[PDB]
């Protein structure tokens with residue numbers, strides 16, 4: 082018995098036929114890419130006001146520290162499956178310093194797109210399916226994966242004239258890291274502005290661009306924290322609520338249902354395959 086994957090995490094959700102997932106102000110804690118196994122689905126981004134049709138050759142990229150508002154509805158007469166690959170921070174910082182040379186046009190890209198669509202060529206279909214096939218690959222050295230992912234993200238960015246992988250100087254990254262370092266603390270806007278030794282304009286623009294008040298942002302971060310806790314194997318709802326910084330199981334359940342459109346136990350089952 083050896084270790085689990087330190088660069089990625091792979092998560093699992095069963096989309097029953099014609100069902101609709103609705104995400105309202107969900108905080109993306111790490112760079113994510115997801116795709117469906119078969120059939121097709123209607124993906125409605127309520128941020129950029131755009132509806133797409135995604136197939137098994139599509140991948141959706143979700144930018145770290147974004148606040149997503151979108152829906153996913155199966156269009157096929159089949160029970161389809163959504164696989165979510167999360168790329169952890171160490172791997173992302175490896176990617177940031179991997180591409181040889183200066184990309185002269187990247188200095189002119191914009192950061193305004195948080196949800197990017199890429200219709201895969203056969204090579205990328207292969208590589209991604211092999212990454213998520215098992216819990217190890219080992220046929221795939223992490224250096225091969227660094228090269229692959231740096232190239233893939235560059236391709237997507239060029240497709241959209243936008244920055245996917247930001248630097249770590251980003252103000253939203255600082256806010257998120259600070260909140261997550263003490264998730265149970267009763268943070269207030271002034272505390273974060275003071276500890277981040279940054280004025281309230283620089284920081285409040287991060288809230289306005291994502292369309293969230295401060296309390297909404299704290300709640301979204303805590304919901305994503307609770308989901309990460311459920312990833313780690315913690316399954317007691319009371320512990321999940323308290324460790325994520327919520328005052329009560331009832332308030333945590335209310336916020337979780339408002340954000341993910343399912344109760345914490347329902348998400349638990351969709352992730353676990355194990356009902357009570």
Ligand SMILES: CCCCCC/C=C/CCCCCCCC(=O)O
Pocket residue numbers: 092093094102104107113115153163165167308
């Ligand atoms: C929170 C990101 C959801 C984007 C994935 C598309 C839909 C997936 C099915 C519902 C899963 C919601 C929790 C996903 C969290 C994760 O696996 O990283």
